[PDB]
Every structure is written in C-alpha cells, then in structure tokens.
Write a protein that binds this ligand. Structure first.
Ligand SMILES: Cc1cccc(C(=O)N(C)C)c1C
Length: 460
C-alpha cells in the first residue's frame, strides 16, 4: 500500500450566529453553491482531511462532532477519525481524517490565543491544530477577529497577536512563528474585514451582488487592500473570490442582506462583506492548488453563509535510509556562497545565522557576519563564503530536493531573531552554484532579505 505524494484537504469556515445548524449541511462538505465549486463527478470521493472552523458556535463539542461525522458518513460512506478538536469560547476547530491515515498522523498540537485587553478580551481570538502527515507538517488556524467596519487596524493587530502567540508545531523551531513552522499553513475564519464603501451606497451594493458584479466591491474589500499595502497576511495566498458576500443575511432565507443599524448591532451598519475567508501559506516550490473556494446557498440558520475551500497539497513520505535518521550521510552537503542579509534595523549589533531543518540532526549556528552600510541607508550583513557546510541526515536526492532550510538572523548581543525566512532545496541542478533568496520577517512583518548562492550535493 504506497504512501501518498498528494492529499486533498477540505477547509470550512462558518460563523453559526449562535444558532443550531439545519438538519442537512452536506452542501458545505461537497463545495456546492456559489463561487469556485467542486465538480459533481467528485461527490463520492472523500477528501483526506476535513478541517472545520466555526465561530459563534452554540453546540457542545460532542453535539458538533456527531453532526459532522454523520454528515461525512452520509456523503462518503466513510467513518472519519477525530484527529483533534479545540474550542475557545464559541470559536472551534475540528480535524477529521480518513481512517487509512490514522498511522500517518502524529505530533498533534492544539492551542488558542485570546485577543485584546480588558474591554476587548472576552470573545475574539483563534484556535489552531498542527500535526505531521508522514514527512509533511500541516498547520490550521481558525480565527474570529474584531468586528466592525472601522476596526481594520484592530483586526491587523489581532492577526499579529495570533501569529506571535499561537504555540503550534515543533517547539525546537524556537526563532520561528507559525508562519514558518509548516510545509502548509491554512488560516481561515470570520476575519471580519468589510467592504469599505459609504453607508449611503448599501442598496447600490446589493444591486451589484444581485448582478453577480463583484469587481467594484472587491476593490474596496479591506482584507485585499490591507494585504496589498503589506499591513496583514504578508506572504499568504487567497483564491479569487467569485461568490457573493457571506455577511450579513436575514436568517432563514438568502434573499435579503440585513445591513441597517439596529440596537442589536450597537447602532452599526453591516454593509454586505466577505467576512468569512480561507488563506494559506506553503513553503516555496511545494505543490498546493486551490480546487474550490465558495459559499453555500442552502444553509440559512446564521446571518453568515458557510465558506468552503479545498486544496491539493503535496506530501512526502517518512524517509529511512541505511544512514539517517540517527546519523549523517556524508554523500550529502549544503554549501552557501556570496551570502548576505539586508536588514531594515536602525541598530548596530553583530549578527549570526541559525539554519533549522528536519534534514539536519540539529540546528546550525554560523559565525558572525561583517556589517557594512548599504547605498540607501540599509544594514548589510555579509557572510561571504564563511557560512558552515550543512550535513543532511539523508543524501538521496528523492528526499533532499524535497526539503527546506529555515534561516533566522540573530543579534549576538540579545540572541533575538531580527528576521526569519525559508529556502527550498528543490533546485534546478545539483553540484551547481545557484541563486537563493528569501524575504525575512519578524512577527510576520518584513524586516529584510537574505540572498546568495547554494551548492547542493546529493548521492546522485
Ligand atoms: C490581493 C493581494 C494582496 C497582496 C499580495 C497579493 C499577491 O500575492 N501578489 C502576487 C500581488 C495579492 C494578490
């Protein structure tokens, strides 16, 4: 029974509006409704992994698990195994997998982050799950961010708190936040970004939605515009949106957007918006293809419609050779030529690098680089030919070309990371000097760049 090189992952996000679901929710898991929908010919084909994110979820974990498992059994005739479930207040994540994957999944982690302080601490934040699927690390974040059209900056701040403080994945990757710990990271939820148009334009917006003309609305979507301006979700992807805004509906129909200010809304307008979103970030040159992104039309208990997204995602096997794991394979090496970091910092400390990768027995610290001034004010940290030769555990190119090296540039004075990035070993050639590049981030904000050349020796 061969190990897979691809899996499909279903991501669902639904703000349930504190109401129990209707008796049938199978359209959600089948990616049917509006937007990029799944072909009918696939309906009986189970996804490998289903990850369900809810917000304003009134159900117990037991009640929701029973609905989800019975839903998937009805669709697929497969009884899914529960990988993980985690709830913060009314924010929940469930991970279900086909039983054949039970012995492929390990290192299951769960965590939550509460956002805000005093006033603003008490119902918003995030839950997450991570695990290994054979050789591939997967992370999943369900967040319910701050509501209200005039709070996009609060949402951005909530995002940064969540990616700093959510403790998922390999704790040995100590310089790295969740935006670097996973082969594939999926981040979804009621992100609560709105269509920023004047209140007086509400009926105009509704007209545009009825005509399925989303372009003049998406050009004012706060998540797209904040992402454009590098204020949030730097280096994440989102599929094109081709479904109607998923908020705010009258319950028990989808024929009506309820946007007018009410005591129940704190006298706020809720212009139709794409509150409910799925984004992802995968390591460079790993296969990931969005195969659906849309909203259901037939689930109407909430003032939000469910959103679905499905993905093909590349995975690797749990590789064993005669040598590693448990030793190095001297027919493998990773070398670095002409390397330098460019940093945005105004500070003057010495810097060194740390290389982290599951292809190494443990992380590697470099010597300090040589600081120079860039021609436009920048700090340039030169490593030249001084970086260590990295000794992978396995030399087979079928393993090594699928790996990645995480890089942190650290202050000698404080040992604090000033920037993190990731280099793919999926090279065009071995035993050949080739350019490498990553942006560097810290707390998910751009802090610099790392560039140079690599020379990879495999056993072939
Ligand atoms: C809407 C948005 C915002 C920020 C970055 C991107 C992106 O990945 N580009 C390659 C431009 C996009 C598509």
């Amino acid at each position: 029974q061969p190990e897979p090189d691809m899996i499909t992952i279903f991501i669902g996000t639904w703000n349930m509006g504190n109401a129990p679901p209707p008796k049938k929710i199978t359209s959600w898991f089948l990616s049917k409704g509006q937007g990029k929908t799944r072909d009918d010919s696939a309906d009986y084909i189970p996804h490998d992994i289903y990850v369900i994110g809810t917000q304003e979820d009134p159900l117990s974990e037991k009640e929701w698990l029973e609905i989800l498992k019975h839903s998937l059994q009805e669709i697929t005739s497969v009884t899914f195994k529960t990988v993980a479930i985690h709830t913060l207040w009314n924010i929940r994540i469930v991970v279900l997998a086909k039983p054949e994957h039970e012995n492929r999944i390990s290192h299951i982690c769960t965590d939550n982050v509460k956002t805000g302080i005093a006033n603003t601490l008490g119902n918003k934040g995030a839950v997450g799950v991570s695990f290994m699927f054979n050789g591939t690390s997967l992370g999943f974040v369900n967040s319910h961010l701050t509501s209200g059209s005039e709070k996009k900056l609060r949402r951005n701040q909530n995002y940064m708190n969540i990616l700093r403080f959510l403790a998922l994945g390999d704790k040995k990757l100590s310089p790295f936040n969740i935006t670097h710990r996973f082969t594939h990271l999926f981040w979804f939820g009621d992100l609560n970004y709105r269509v920023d148009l004047p209140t007086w334009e509400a009926e105009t917006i509704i007209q545009k939605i009825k005509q399925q003309q989303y372009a003049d609305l998406l050009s004012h979507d706060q998540l797209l515009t904040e992402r454009r301006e590098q204020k949030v979700f730097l280096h994440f992807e989102e599929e094109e949106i081709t479904f109607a805004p998923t908020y705010r509906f009258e319950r028990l129909t989808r024929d009506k957007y309820a946007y007018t200010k009410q005591k129940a809304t704190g006298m706020k307008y809720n212009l139709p918006s794409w509150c409910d979103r799925v984004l992802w970030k995968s390591y460079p040159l790993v296969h990931v293809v969005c195969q659906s992104y849309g909203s259901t039309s037939d689930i109407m208990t909430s003032d939000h419609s469910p959103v679905f997204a499905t993905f093909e995602a590349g995975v690797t096997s749990q590789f064993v050779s005669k040598n590693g794991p448990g030793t190095v394979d001297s027919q493998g090496q990773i070398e670095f030529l002409r390397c330098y970091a460019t940093l945005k910092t105004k500070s003057q400390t010495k810097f060194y690098l740390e290389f982290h990768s599951s292809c190494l027995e443990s992380f590697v610290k470099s010597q300090e680089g040589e600081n120079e001034e860039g021609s436009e004010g920048e700090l340039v940290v030169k490593f030249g030919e001084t970086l260590p030769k990295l000794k992978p555990i396995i030399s087979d190119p079928e393993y090594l070309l699928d790996q990645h090296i995480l890089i942190s540039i650290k202050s000698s004075d404080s040992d604090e990371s000033y920037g993190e990035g990731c280099i793919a070993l999926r090279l065009e050639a071995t035993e050949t000097q080739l350019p490498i590049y990553t942006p560097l981030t810290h707390h998910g904000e751009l802090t610099g760049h790392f560039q140079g050349e690599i020379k990879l020796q495999t056993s072939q």
